Symmetry: C5
Subunit: 200 residues, 5 copies
Amino acid sequence: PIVHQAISPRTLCCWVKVVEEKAFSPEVIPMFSALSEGATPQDLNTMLNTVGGHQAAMQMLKETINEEAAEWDRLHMREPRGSDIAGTTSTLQEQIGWMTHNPPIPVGEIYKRWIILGLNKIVRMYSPTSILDIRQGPKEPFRDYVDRFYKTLRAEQASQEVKNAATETLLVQNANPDCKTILKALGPGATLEEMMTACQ
Amino acid sequence: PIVVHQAISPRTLCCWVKVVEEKAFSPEVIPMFSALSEGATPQDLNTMLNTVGGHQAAMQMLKETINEEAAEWDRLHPMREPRGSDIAGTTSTLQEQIGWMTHNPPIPVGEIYKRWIILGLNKIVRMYSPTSILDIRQGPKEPFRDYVDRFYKTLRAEQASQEVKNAATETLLVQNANPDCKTILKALGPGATLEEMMTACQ
Amino acid sequence: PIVVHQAISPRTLCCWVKVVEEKAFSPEVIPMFSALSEGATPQDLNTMLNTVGGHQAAMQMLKETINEEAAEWDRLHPMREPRGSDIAGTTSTLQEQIGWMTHNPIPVGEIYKRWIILGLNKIVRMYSPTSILDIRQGPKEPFRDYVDRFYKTLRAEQASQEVKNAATETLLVQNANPDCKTILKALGPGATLEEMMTACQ
Amino acid sequence: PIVHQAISPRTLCCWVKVVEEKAFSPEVIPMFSALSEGATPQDLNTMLNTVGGHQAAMQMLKETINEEAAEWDRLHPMREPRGSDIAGTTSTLQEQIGWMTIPVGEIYKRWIILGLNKIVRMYSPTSILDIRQGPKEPFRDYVDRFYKTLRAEQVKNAATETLLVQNANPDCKTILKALGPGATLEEMMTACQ
Amino acid sequence: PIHQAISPRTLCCWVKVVEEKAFSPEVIPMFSALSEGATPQDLNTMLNTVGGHQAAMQMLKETINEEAAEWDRLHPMREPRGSDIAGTTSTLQEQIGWMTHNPPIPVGEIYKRWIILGLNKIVRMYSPTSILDIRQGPKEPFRDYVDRFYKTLRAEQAKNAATETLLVQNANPDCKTILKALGPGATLEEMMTACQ
Ligand SMILES: CC(C)(C#Cc1ccc(-c2ccc(Cl)c3c(NS(=O)(=O)C4CC4)nn(CC(F)F)c23)c([C@H](Cc2cc(F)cc(F)c2)NC(=O)Cn2nc(C(F)F)c3c2C(F)(F)[C@@H]2C[C@H]32)n1)S(C)(=O)=O
Ligand SMILES: CC(C)(C#Cc1ccc(-c2ccc(Cl)c3c(NS(=O)(=O)C4CC4)nn(CC(F)F)c23)c([C@H](Cc2cc(F)cc(F)c2)NC(=O)Cn2nc(C(F)F)c3c2C(F)(F)[C@@H]2C[C@H]32)n1)S(C)(=O)=O
Ligand SMILES: CC(C)(C#Cc1ccc(-c2ccc(Cl)c3c(NS(=O)(=O)C4CC4)nn(CC(F)F)c23)c([C@H](Cc2cc(F)cc(F)c2)NC(=O)Cn2nc(C(F)F)c3c2C(F)(F)[C@@H]2C[C@H]32)n1)S(C)(=O)=O
Ligand SMILES: CC(C)(C#Cc1ccc(-c2ccc(Cl)c3c(NS(=O)(=O)C4CC4)nn(CC(F)F)c23)c([C@H](Cc2cc(F)cc(F)c2)NC(=O)Cn2nc(C(F)F)c3c2C(F)(F)[C@@H]2C[C@H]32)n1)S(C)(=O)=O
Ligand SMILES: CC(C)(C#Cc1ccc(-c2ccc(Cl)c3c(NS(=O)(=O)C4CC4)nn(CC(F)F)c23)c([C@H](Cc2cc(F)cc(F)c2)NC(=O)Cn2nc(C(F)F)c3c2C(F)(F)[C@@H]2C[C@H]32)n1)S(C)(=O)=O
C-alpha cells in the first residue's frame, strides 16, 4: 500500500479467515476490495497466495488475469505490459514508481479490477442454482426459502432493473401451495415484512 | 470513516462480520453496529452491510426501510444540498459525502444513514424473536435461571417504553412462572428483587 | 474515553464480547473488564454491557445493583453536581460526562466502574453455587483436577484474605480421598503444593 | 524490527494462529515472509520459538539453518558476521542492530524460507501422478486436491492438461474427451458440473 | 508497559494462547515477549486473566513467594521488599517511581524472572514422561513419534548425540532396521522420507 508501508498482519489474517469461513459468497468481493485499498500488485499477490484451499477457483482467477493481461497487451519509465500489471515481471520499486509518478498509472487498481472480475466469475460459478430453479419445499419454513432465493439472486448478479421484476414475480410464483395462497391473498405490492409475518 | 479520510479499518469489518455471524440478530447487535460505525461515511456503511453474510431476507427488509426513510427525507427536504438517494450512498461519490461531512455547519449524512440503518435493525431484531413477552411462559421442569434469561432476551428484543420494561419485567416474571416457583415468589412478598427470586427458586 | 474523546475502539468491544461469551461468568472476567475499561465514560461502559449477548439475567441483576449504588450515592450526596442516575449515564449527555471527568482537579467513570465491579463480583459469587467446604475429591479423580476445582471455588467465593491461609492449608488436606489423604499425611507438615502433586501424580 | 521497536503482539498471535490452523501448507510461506518484515534475528527466533507442535518440522528447519550457516562460513571467511552470528546463536542484540542498521535479517529469512519450502514439500506426500478421480467424487473436489498437490510440489502447466484427462473417472473421462482439446478450466468445470 | 495500561489486544492474545496451548514450552517465549516494559501490576493482571489451571497458578504463586523471600534475605524512594516486587504491597506510583528512577530497579524484569522460573516448573510438571521412556508404537507413523520425542526433549530443557542415538534406538523394529541401514549422519528429512 502507498509512503509505502508493508501489508499489515491484521489485514492478511482477516482475509485468510474470511476466505476460509465464508467460502466464496458475494460478500468476499466487497471485503476484498476493502482490504486491498491502494495495494500494489505484490501485495495483491501476497493476499491471493494466503488463500487456503479453493485452489480450483484460484487457478480460474489466474486464468482470468492472464486473459485480461493479453487483452491489455493487444490494446497497448517504460510503459507497463500485461504481465507487468499482474506483478510477474516488475519489481516493487517499478510498481511504486508507476503508481506514484505524476501523472500516475495505477497498476494496483487495474490488477484489482481484473481480480474482482475473476472473483465475480468465481462467485457466480459457486452458486449453480438458477433463480428459476429455486422453489419452496413442502414442509420448509418461508424464511429459509426467502433466504435461499435472495442468496441465489445476489450470486447471479443481474441488473437491478431485472432484480425488481425477478424479486416480485419469481418469489410469488415458486411458493409452496399454502404460503402461495396466503401471499396471493395478501394483495399486490405486499412488502417483504408483511409476507414474512403472514407466513410464519 | 472520518476522525482526514481514513479507509475503513480491517479490524472493524472483520469484527462486524464475526459478530453478525456469531450472534445472528439479537438486540446486542444494534449497539455493536452503532459502536463499530463511528463517523462512517455512507460508502463505508454500505461496505459494512455488503460484508454481512447470509440473512439476505433481513437485508432486503433493511433496504426497503431505507427506501421508505429516504422518501420521507426527500418529502421534508425538497456545495449543493444532499437528496434522499445521496444519503443512502447510492447516487453520491465519496468526495461529495466527505465535503458534506467536513463543511461547517456540516450536513452529517453518516449519522442520518446510520439512524435509518438502526431503525431497520430494530425492525429486524424485533421480527427475528417472534415470541411476545406475554406469550413467553416458564416450562414444567425448567430452572428459573433459564426462564429469566429467555424472558429478558425477549423483553429487550421487543424494546418498548421503559415503563413497560419495569412493570412487565416484574409482574410477568412472577405471573408466567411455573406453579411451584410462582408460589415461592408470591410468598417472597412484593418488591422482591431478581436476586432474591433466583436464590429462592434454585 | 478521554485520552480528546476517543470513541470506544472496535477491538476492545470485540474482545470483551468474545470473553463474556467463551468464559461465561468466571472470576477472570472481572480483571479483564477492569483492564479493558480504562478511563471509559459511562456511555462507553453501557455500550460494553449492552454488547454482552445472553446471560440477560445476570445483566438485569447488574442493573439492579447499579440502581442500588446510585440510590446510595444520591442519599449520601444531595456545572451541577451529578445525581445517581447521572453517574450511570441515564440522565446525562456525553458532554456532561466529559466535562465532569476532564474538569481539573471528579472522575465519575471510575465510580461507575466500581459499581459495575461490585455487581460483577455478586454475579460471579452466584454463578459458583458450591462452597469450598462442599468440594471433595472423587473416587477415581486425579489429584490435579481436585486441586483445580478447589482453588477455582476458592477464587470464586471472594472471602477475606485472612481465611485464605487457614482454608487452603487445612481443607485441602481434609477433603482429599483416602489414598491421597494418607500419602499427603505421610508427606509431613510444611509441604508445598508442587511436592504434593508430584507425590500423587 | 528496524528504531528497533519490539515485535508487536498482534503479529506473533496471528502467526501462531496461522501455523496452528493451516498446519504447514504453501500459504504459510507468504504469511511468514509478510509477518517478518524488517525483523531482526532475535525477532525471527522469537517467532520460531512460539510455533507450537510440528516439532519435527522445526528440527528440520533448524538443520537447514545450520547447513546454510556452514555454507555461508565457507563462502565468507564492526567485525564480520559468522554463520552462527546470522542464526542469532552467538550474537548479541546490539551486534544485530548494528549489522542491520549487512542485512542479516534478510539472509536468515531466506534460510528459514528455504527450510519451510522443504517442510511443505514433505508435508504433501502424494504425487501428481497418483491423484485420480474417485467413483462418486465431485469433480470440483478432485480439481482442488490436484491443484493443492501441484502447488505443494512446487512443466507443471503442460502436465496439468494431460493429468486432467488422466484423473477423470470413466463418465467424466468421456465427457472431457468429447469436450475437445484447448478447453479452459472455467468451461471444463461448467461442463463437468 | 513503559505508562500506558496493557493494551487490549495483548491481554486477549495472552488469554487465547494460555487457553489453546495449555502449558507448553512455547508459552514462555510468548509470555516474555508480551510483557516488555510491563509493570508488576500488569504482570499480575496478565496472570489473573489466565482461565483454569488454578493449581498451576497456585504453584506459580508459591514460586513467587520463594523468590521474594530469597530476595528479602539477600537485600535486607524506599527499598523494595519481596512482596513489593510482586506488586502485592506497592501502589502503582511506587512501581512507576522505582522503574523510572535513573538507577533502574527492574520490578518488571525481576518479577518476570520469578514467573518464568515458576512457568518452567509448571511445564516440566505437565510433561511427566522422560526422553528415555518414549518409544515408537507398533502402528504409529514415524512423524508422530519424532514429534512426541522432540516435544518431550523441549519439556526436559536439558544433548544432540544422545537425542540422535536414542531416536534410532527407541524406534519400532521395522523403522529401527531401516534407520540403522540408512547409515550414520543421515538428516532427519532423509530418515522421515525413508520411513514414509
Ligand atoms: C461497489 C461498492 C462501492 C458499493 C456499493 C453500494 C452502493 C449502494 C448500495 C445501496 C444502498 C442503499 C440502497 Cl436503498 C440501495 C438500493 N436500493 S434499491 O431497492 O435497489 C432502489 C434504489 C434502486 N440499491 N443499492 C445498490 C445500488 F447498486 F443500486 C443500494 C449498496 C447496497 C448496500 C446494502 C447491502 C445490504 F445488504 C443492505 C443494505 F441496506 C445496503 N448493496 C446491495 O444492496 C447489494 N444487494 N444487491 C442485491 C440484489 F441482488 F437484489 C441485494 C443486495 C442486498 F442488500 F445484500 C440484499 C440481497 C439483496 N452498495 S462496495 C466496494 O462498497 O461494495
Ligand atoms: C442507545 C445507547 C446510547 C444507550 C444506552 C443506555 C443508557 C442507559 C442505560 C442504563 C444504565 C444504568 C441503569 Cl441503572 C439503567 C436502567 N435502570 S432501570 O432499572 O431501568 C431504572 C432507572 C429506570 N435502565 N437503563 C436503560 C434506560 F434506557 F432506561 C439503564 C443503558 C443500559 C445499559 C446496561 C445494560 C446491561 F445489560 C447491564 C447494565 F448494567 C447496563 N441498557 C439496558 O439496560 C438495556 N436493557 N433493557 C432491558 C429491558 F428489557 F428490561 C434490559 C436491558 C439489559 F440490561 F440488557 C437486561 C436485559 C434487560 N443503556 S447505546 C448506542 O449504547 O445502545
Ligand atoms: C485487584 C488488582 C489490582 C490486583 C491484584 C493482585 C495483587 C497482588 C497479587 C499477588 C502477587 C504475588 C503474590 Cl506471591 C501474591 C500472594 N501471595 S500469598 O500466598 O497470598 C502470601 C503473601 C500473602 N497473594 N497475592 C494476592 C494479594 F492480594 F495478597 C499475590 C495478585 C495475584 C496475582 C496472581 C494470580 C495468579 F493466578 C498467579 C500469580 F502468580 C499471581 N492474585 C491472586 O493471587 C489471586 N488469587 N487469589 C487466590 C485465593 F483464592 F487463594 C488464588 C489466586 C490465584 F493466584 F489465582 C490462584 C487461585 C489462587 N493480584 S487487579 C485489578 O489486577 O485484579
Ligand atoms: C531466549 C530467547 C532470547 C532465544 C533464543 C534462541 C536463540 C537461538 C536459537 C537458535 C537459532 C538457530 C539455530 Cl541453528 C539454533 C541451534 N542449532 S543447534 O542444532 O542446537 C547447534 C548450534 C548448536 N540451537 N539454537 C538454540 C541455542 F540456544 F543453541 C538455535 C533459538 C532456537 C529458535 C528456533 C526454534 C525452532 F523451532 C526452529 C528454528 F529453526 C529455530 N530455539 C530452539 O531451537 C529451541 N529448541 N530447543 C530444542 C531442544 F529441545 F532440542 C528444540 C528447539 C526447537 F527448535 F523448537 C525444536 C524442538 C527442538 N532460540 S527467546 C526470548 O526468543 O526465547
Ligand atoms: C514469492 C512472492 C514474492 C511472490 C509471488 C507471485 C508473483 C506473481 C504471481 C502471479 C501473478 C499473476 C499471474 Cl497471471 C501469474 C501466473 N500465471 S501463469 O498461468 O503461471 C502464466 C504466466 C505464466 N503465474 N504466477 C506465478 C509466477 F511465479 F509465475 C503469477 C504469483 C501468483 C499469485 C496468485 C495466487 C493465486 F492463488 C491466484 C492468483 F490469481 C495469483 N502465485 C501463484 O500463482 C502460485 N501458484 N502456483 C501454482 C502452480 F502450482 F501452478 C498455482 C498457484 C495458484 F495460483 F495458487 C494456483 C494453485 C495454482 N505470485 S510472495 C512472498 O508474495 O509469495
